[PDB]
Amino acid sequence: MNIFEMLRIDEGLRLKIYKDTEGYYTIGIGHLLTKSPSLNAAKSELDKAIGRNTNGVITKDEAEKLFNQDVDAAVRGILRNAKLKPVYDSLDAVRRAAAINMVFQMGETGVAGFTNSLRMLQQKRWDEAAVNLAKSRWYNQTPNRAKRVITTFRTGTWDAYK
Ligand SMILES: CNc1ccccc1
Numbered sequence: 001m002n003i004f005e006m007l008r009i010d011e012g013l014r015l016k017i018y019k020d021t022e023g024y025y026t027i028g029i030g031h032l033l034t035k036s037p038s039l040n041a042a043k044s045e046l047d048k049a050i051g052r053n054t055n056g057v058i059t060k061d062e063a064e065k066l067f068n069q070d071v072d073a074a075v076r077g078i079l080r081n082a083k084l085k086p087v088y089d090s091l092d093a094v095r096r097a098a099a100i101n102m103v104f105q106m107g108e109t110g111v112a113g114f115t116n117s118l119r120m121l122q123q124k125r126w127d128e129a130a131v132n133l134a135k136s137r138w139y140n141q142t143p144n145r146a147k148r149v150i151t152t153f154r155t156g157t158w159d160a161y162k
Contacts, residue, residue, distance in 0.1 A: 001158040003071060003097040007104055009161055010145050013063060017042055017056040021142055027056075028063030030104065031070055074103045081108055087118045095121070098152040105145075106138060121153065130154035 011030030017039070020026040025033045025042035031049070033042040039056075046054050050062055058066075078084045078099065088099050102111050112118075114136070120129035130150050133139065139146040148160035 001161050003100050004067070006097055006101060006152075006158075006161055007067070007071065010101065010105075010148070013060070015058055015060065015063060017046065027058060027066075029067040029070075031063070031066045070104065071100065074100050077108050078103055081112065083112045083115075083118065084108065087122045090122050090124075092156055094156045094158065095153055098149050101149050101152075102138075105142075110138075126154045126156075 008029055013029050014027065017025055017027050017033065020030070020032065024035050025039065025045075027033060027046060033045040033049075036042065043054070043056050046056065046058070049066060050058060054062075078088050084099070084103070088096060091099060099111075102114075114133065117129050117132045120132055130153060133150045133153065134146065136146075139150070151160040152158070
């Protein structure tokens with residue numbers, strides 16, 4: 001198990017444009033295309049990302065390419081965020097994957113509002129952090145996925161993904 005396998009489980013793989021849990025046009029392995037309610041706008045974003053006229057359909061290779069870029073961009077974003085970087089750096093590799101998972105799902109900004117969880121995670125108060133993390137819109141809207149990510153934060157193991 002690793003960050004790529006973890007997010008592949010949580011996000012799935014779909015080669016046609018679909019709506020994510022929030023109703024936003026998405027493709028591949030959780031690659032958000034747009035928050036716009038326009039399908040044509042999403043197809044435009046897809047063509048831009050892939051570099052060809054896709055007509056709402058991509059290959060597995062293309063999906064995995066976007067997935068690579070998205071994971072890489074999530075990590076690089078964390079490291080350029082003044083609030084997230086110190087907490088991330090303080091974590092072990094397993095919990096770092098849980099950190100990337102969150103940023104991948106809700107964006108950098110969404111996570112930065114977990115100020116109290118971030119502090120508990122840096123202090124390594126794992127049970128407390130796990131309790132605080134679940135007191136969120138994130139947990140309430142996606143409980144099963146959030147439980148897995150929180151368990152990873154709590155334990156520093158891959159038990160929730162086995
Ligand atoms: C709580 N998730 C998270 C995300 C990014 C860096 C540290 C922690």
